[PDB]
UniProtKB/Swiss-Prot annotation:
Protein name from the UniProt record: Bromodomain-containing protein 1
Whole-protein residues included: 555 to 674 of 1058
Subunit structure, interactors included: Component of some HBO1 complex composed of KAT7/HBO1, MEAF6, ING4 and BRD1/BRPF2. Component of the MOZ/MORF complex composed at least of ING5, KAT6A, KAT6B, MEAF6 and one of BRPF1, BRD1/BRPF2 and BRPF3. Interacts (via PHD-type zinc finger domain) with unmodified histone H3. Interacts (via PWWP domain) with dimethylated and trimethylated 'Lys-79' on histone H3.
Domain Bromo intervals: 9-113
Expression sites (tissue/organ): Highly expressed in testis.
Location within or outside the cell: Nucleus; Chromosome
The organism's place on the tree of life at top rank: Eukaryota
Covalent link Glycyl lysine isopeptide (Lys-Gly) (interchain with G-Cter in SUMO2), residues: K41
Protein purpose: Scaffold subunit of various histone acetyltransferase (HAT) complexes, such as the MOZ/MORF and HBO1 complexes, that acts as a regulator of hematopoiesis. Plays a key role in HBO1 complex by directing KAT7/HBO1 specificity towards histone H3 'Lys-14' acetylation (H3K14ac), thereby promoting erythroid differentiation.
Amino acid sequence: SMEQVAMELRLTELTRLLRSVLDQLQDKDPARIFAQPVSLKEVPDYLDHIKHPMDFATMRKRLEAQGYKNLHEFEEDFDLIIDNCMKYNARDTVFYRAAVRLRDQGGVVLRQARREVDSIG
């Protein structure tokens, strides 16, 4: 149906906007602390602590499969990256501090992305 095509074109355009949001958020992590999944070989207890691990590579695979239907879903995953790190790691650590900085800087980007998603539809 033509309705299904138009919906898919909207999904595709959301995916475009989310890819750019993702690039801007990742630029706020120059250290690359959040680039890849936590290794269970190197942190064998990780899953006892963290129930839903997340990282920018895993967000990027979901994105390229057009797997985010709305900004809310994308934000949920971004928040997991931050929130997981701030639980596993103590306040005095480079990891925790990096998550705080990513959150604060990411907020700016996400605030305007929400306006763009509403504005364009």
